[PDB]
Amino acid sequence: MVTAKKDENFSEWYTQAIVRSEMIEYYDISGCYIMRPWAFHIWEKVQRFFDDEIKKMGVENSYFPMFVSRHKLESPEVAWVTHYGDSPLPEKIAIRPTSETIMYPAYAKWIRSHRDLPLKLNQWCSVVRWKQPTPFLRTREFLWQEGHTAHATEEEAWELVLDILELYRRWYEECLAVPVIKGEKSEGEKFAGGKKTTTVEAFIPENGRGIQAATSHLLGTNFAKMFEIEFEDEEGHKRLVHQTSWGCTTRSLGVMIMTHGDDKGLVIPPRVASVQVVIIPILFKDENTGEILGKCRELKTMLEKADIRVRIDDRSNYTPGWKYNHWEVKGVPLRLELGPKDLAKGTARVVRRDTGEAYQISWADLAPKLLELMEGIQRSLFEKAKARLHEGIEKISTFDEVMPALNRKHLVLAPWCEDPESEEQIKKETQKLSEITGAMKTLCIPFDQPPMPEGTKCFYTGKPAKRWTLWGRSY
Amino acid sequence: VTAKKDENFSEWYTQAIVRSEMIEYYDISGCYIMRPWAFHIWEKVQRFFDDEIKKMGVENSYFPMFVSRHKLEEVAWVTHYGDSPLPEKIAIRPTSETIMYPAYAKWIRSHRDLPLKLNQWCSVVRWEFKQPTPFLRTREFLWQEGHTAHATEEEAWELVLDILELYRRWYEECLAVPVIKGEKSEGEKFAGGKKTTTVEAFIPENGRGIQAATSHLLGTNFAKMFEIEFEDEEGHKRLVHQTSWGCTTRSLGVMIMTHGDDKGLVIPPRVASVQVVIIPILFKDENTGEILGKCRELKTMLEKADIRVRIDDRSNYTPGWKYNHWEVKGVPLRLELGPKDLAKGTARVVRRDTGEAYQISWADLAPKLLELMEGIQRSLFEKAKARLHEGIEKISTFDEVMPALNRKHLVLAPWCEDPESEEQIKKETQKLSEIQGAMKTLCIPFDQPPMPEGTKCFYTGKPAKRWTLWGRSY
Ligand code: PRO
Numbered sequence: 037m038v039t040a041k042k043d044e045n046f047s048e049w050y051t052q053a054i055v056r057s058e059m060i061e062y063y064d065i066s067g068c069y070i071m072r073p074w075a076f077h078i079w080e081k082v083q084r085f086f087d088d089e090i091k092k093m094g095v096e097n098s099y100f101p102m103f104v105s106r107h108k109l110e111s112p113e114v115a116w117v118t119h120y121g122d123s124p125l126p127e128k129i130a131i132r133p134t135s136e137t138i139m140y141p142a143y144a145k146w147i148r149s150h151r152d153l154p155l156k157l158n159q160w161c162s163v164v165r166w167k168q169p170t171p172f173l174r175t176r177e178f179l180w181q182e183g184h185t186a187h188a189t190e191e192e193a194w195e196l197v198l199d200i201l202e203l204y205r206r207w208y209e210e211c212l213a214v215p216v217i218k219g220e221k222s223e224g225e226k227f228a229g230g231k232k233t234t235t236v237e238a239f240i241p242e243n244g245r246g247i248q249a250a251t252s253h254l255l256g257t258n259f260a261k262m263f264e265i266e267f268e269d270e271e272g273h274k275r276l277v278h279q280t281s282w283g284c285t286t287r288s289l290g291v292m293i294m295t296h297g298d299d300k301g302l303v304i305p306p307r308v309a310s311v312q313v314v315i316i317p318i319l320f321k322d323e324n325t326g327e328i329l330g331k332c333r334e335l336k337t338m339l340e341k342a343d344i345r346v347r348i349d350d351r352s353n354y355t356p357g358w359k360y361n362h363w364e365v366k367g368v369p370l371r372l373e374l375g376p377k378d379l380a381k382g383t384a385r386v387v388r389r390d391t392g393e394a395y396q397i398s399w400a401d402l403a404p405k406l407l408e409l410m411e412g413i414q415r416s417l418f419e420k421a422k423a424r425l426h427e428g429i430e431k432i433s434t435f436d437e438v439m440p441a442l443n444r445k446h447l448v449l450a451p452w453c454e455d456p457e458s459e460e461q462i463k464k465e466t467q468k469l470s471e472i473t474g475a476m477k478t479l480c481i482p483f484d485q486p487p488m489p490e491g492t493k494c495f496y497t498g499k500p501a502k503r504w505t506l507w508g509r510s511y
Numbered sequence: 512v513t514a515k516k517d518e519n520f521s522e523w524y525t526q527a528i529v530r531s532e533m534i535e536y537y538d539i540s541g542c543y544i545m546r547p548w549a550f551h552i553w554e555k556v557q558r559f560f561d562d563e564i565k566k567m568g569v570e571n572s573y574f575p576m577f578v579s580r581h582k583l584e585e586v587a588w589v590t591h592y593g594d595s596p597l598p599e600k601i602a603i604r605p606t607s608e609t610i611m612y613p614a615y616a617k618w619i620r621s622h623r624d625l626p627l628k629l630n631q632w633c634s635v636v637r638w639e640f641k642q643p644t645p646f647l648r649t650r651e652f653l654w655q656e657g658h659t660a661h662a663t664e665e666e667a668w669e670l671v672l673d674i675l676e677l678y679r680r681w682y683e684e685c686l687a688v689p690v691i692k693g694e695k696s697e698g699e700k701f702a703g704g705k706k707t708t709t710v711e712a713f714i715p716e717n718g719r720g721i722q723a724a725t726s727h728l729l730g731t732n733f734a735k736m737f738e739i740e741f742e743d744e745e746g747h748k749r750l751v752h753q754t755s756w757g758c759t760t761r762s763l764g765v766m767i768m769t770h771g772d773d774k775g776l777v778i779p780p781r782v783a784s785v786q787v788v789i790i791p792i793l794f795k796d797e798n799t800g801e802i803l804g805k806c807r808e809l810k811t812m813l814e815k816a817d818i819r820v821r822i823d824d825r826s827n828y829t830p831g832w833k834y835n836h837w838e839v840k841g842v843p844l845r846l847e848l849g850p851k852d853l854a855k856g857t858a859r860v861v862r863r864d865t866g867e868a869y870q871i872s873w874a875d876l877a878p879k880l881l882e883l884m885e886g887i888q889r890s891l892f893e894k895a896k897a898r899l900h901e902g903i904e905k906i907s908t909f910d911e912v913m914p915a916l917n918r919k920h921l922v923l924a925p926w927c928e929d930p931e932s933e934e935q936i937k938k939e940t941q942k943l944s945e946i947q948g949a950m951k952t953l954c955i956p957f958d959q960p961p962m963p964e965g966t967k968c969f970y971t972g973k974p975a976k977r978w979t980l981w982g983r984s985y
Pocket residue numbers: 134135136181182183227251253281282283284
């Protein structure tokens with residue numbers, strides 16, 4: 037059971053929710069965590085969804101080495117292997133922080149003709165980047181997928197950037213039921229070396245902080261010229277390829293926990309629940325023990341015929357109430373209870389994890405009714421989170437409105453001139469003002485742009501505003 | 512491929528893997544990029560094995576790749592991040608055991624907590640490889656590693672054998688590679704384990720056995736080291752009985768070696784990223800769409816029967832070049848479509864393993880190909896199975912060893928299972944080859960021939976316990 041309240045000590049609540057649901061075991065090396073099966077199931081669900089979808093686009097999986105040489109890599113985040121035993125290595129080598137400099141010389145070799153394009157590769161793997169750490173959200177080693185494509189034209193690459201971003205929106209919004217906002221990163225927050233970076237952003241109300249949930253980069257021709265990735269044209273001329281890079285990590289899991297967890301623990305959206313329905317037989321004295329177990333197995337068969345993922349917790353060595361607490365901590369969306377009274381009526385009692393509402397459902401009606409309940413729960417998790425997001429964003433016009441909004445734990449949407457030095461000035465000014473990390477930075481320039489009335493000044497510099505921009509305190 | 516597989520096998524292997532586009536080289540020695548043509552085979556066997564161990568209640572997990580100095584008291588030391596030194600150096604994991612088993616000691620308290628069954632899909636780094644080659648001797652490789660804890664030895668041993676059977680199916684049903692189940696000798700088992708089981712394969716071209724996968728009955732020794740104890744139903748503290756089991760991308764190497772021929776790779780249809788390559792008979796600048804349009808219609812029809820299909824419509828290569836290209840990659844089936852094929856409603860299909868050709872009506876295309884594919888798969892297995900049984904000589908005395916070794920064979924010999932005799936045999940077989948390469952045990956096969964009363968060990972003279980399989984090996 038969880039005892040910390042989510043709206044009181046949020047970080048203690050998070051620690052308790054992920055430990056007591058058996059998702060995480062803490063580790064002696066700061067920022068590394070053991071990922072226990074209950075978490076890994078969710079990761080497998082979202083991985084299967086994303087892997088199928090990118091296969092439909094013609095992306096093929098591959099595996100590149102986890103080590104990278106000093107020359108190919110050339111910064112402060114990179115872990116260096118420098119010794120073997122007590123002897124120093126002749127040349128130190130790095131553990132991959134990301135694989136651009138690992139794959140792209142191979143791309144340079146593999147690409148000769150426009151007939152070789154597009155090249156579309158993806159890798160499921162872990163990476164290492166070395167603030168204070170948080171399980172799932174900021175860890176030193178994390179699991180991810182990284183996709184890397186090369187195209188003959190820029191327009192084709194950008195289309196792929198946007199298709200991938202849409203997939204990431206589905207990953208968060210259709211699987212995890214986490215609303216996100218699509219936008220571009222500012223020039224100082226984008227991938228180093230790339231042309232343009234797009235992103236989905238999520239919000240965490242309890243601390244009012246924005247978090248980058250996934251990114252899709254138009255690399256353009258910048259890496260192509262640094263790695264000499266050229267192809268021959270139909271015309272016969274040599275051209276640089278146009279590249280994209282895109283990645284998504286186990287941060288998504290943390291975002292889901294924070295988004296849907298409550299004072300009793302996890303709430304797992306049915307689309308990623310390894311167990312959607314847990315069937316709990318109520319055995320007390322020997323009150324029709326075998327008939328109960330048999331009817332439970334029947335119900336499991338019947339529900340699996342509608343592709344519902346069902347476990348029967350018929351373990352002897354635990355009490356039913358213990359089983360209720362266990363699967364509630366764990367976040368299983370639906371609990372089905374069956375006792376001698378329930379066998380007598382031809383019904384079963386069903387409790388939704390998200391709200392606690394109980395239903396008596398006859399056996400014949402179980403499958404369609406539970407499908408309806410699961411779709412209701414998924415949709416309701418999403419809509420409540422989306423409402424919290426809508427009320428977490430203040431639209432403002434001048435700098436004076438910023439500190440009040442931030443202190444309500446809100447994001448700000450403000451007209452901005454998009455000058456890069458102004459972002460640094462704003463970060464430092466908001467840090468200083470919050471003293472009396474507290475800094476506000478750009479989360480993204482949203483795709484969905486309100487109208488910009490003629491003569492709207494930048495909310496900070498007074499120069500003409502270019503676009504509406506989403507700022508907040510960040511992860 | 513110019514090297515001949517029976518005549519210069521090392522060379523044949525290197526040429527065949529590179530010309531097949533399965534791997535790419537890298538600027539850090541011993542590391543190889545797995546390109547999709549090979550990674551897809553990994554993905555298929557991974558999915559099969561993972562489905563089957565999930566049917567057993569094994570669940571996947573992830574453990575960090577670093578180990579502290581504190582917890583370790585020939586490791587790779589990470590000592591800096593950026594230009595900044597770490598306060599204390601950390602290390603890259605030597606074992607996963609050293610990270611998982613303290614966690615196991617924490618998680619297991621009561622008989623209620625058993626059995627615990629975990630698996631990890633990950634990569635592994637080994638820093639001392641002698642001279643590298645793809646899939647066999649590499650600085651980094653992929654694998655799965657399963658670790659379980661049970662309340663009794665019988666349950667753990669049951670799982671050891673169930674996993675071994677899954678491994679047999681991995682090799683034999685996916686990769687069409689025949690393997691032999693057995694238990695390792697005392698001198699070749701996992702160090703602190705009770706019993707190690709193995710599937711073994713055989714490479715006829717150099718006559719070497721190669722270990723395909725291992726499933727260990729660890730017993731209670733690791734439980735004693737790490738204090739993985741549980742309280743049983745009567746209140747007593749007992750030690751858990753552990754198992755571990757693993758299998759690696761070396762499996763891909765063994766498939767190459769088994770099925771490849773002088774033209775190059777032959778990939779079993781069950782795991783081939785492309786099962787059917789469609790080759791339009793065209794030449795540059797001629798494309799009117801008639802031939803490519805029919806090729807696309809055929810692709811759609813074959814994909815409806817869940818056949819994995821690729822069309823090679825590249826303009827700059829002649830059809831002969833493409834035939835050679837896809838044969839060197841080892842696509843099981845090629846479908847040639849040209850002007851007469853079009854003008855008569857047929858297609859010409861060629862099997863990669865035998866070179867036999869079929870003129871097939873478009874209507875019959877999808878059924879027939881399914882048939883062809885299953886045939887190819889079965890044929891690949893049974894031919895290899897025959898080679899395996901022709902490579903094993905059943906002997907009785909040491910006198911027969913050196914001849915059999917020189918026929919590039921394995922020997923099945925009655926043995927007293929004394930470990931020192933195993934190391935003596937390694938030394939002598941080795942000295943004899945030098946004067947003309949050592950011969951070790953591969954396994955004691957589960958399938959034991961009858962042992963006539965009073966048979967003596969082929970080397971020591973003492974009473975024989977069991978028939979043991981010996982050979983040179985990888
Ligand atoms: O690390 C990143 O952000 C990009 C996207 C995935 C690969 N590299």
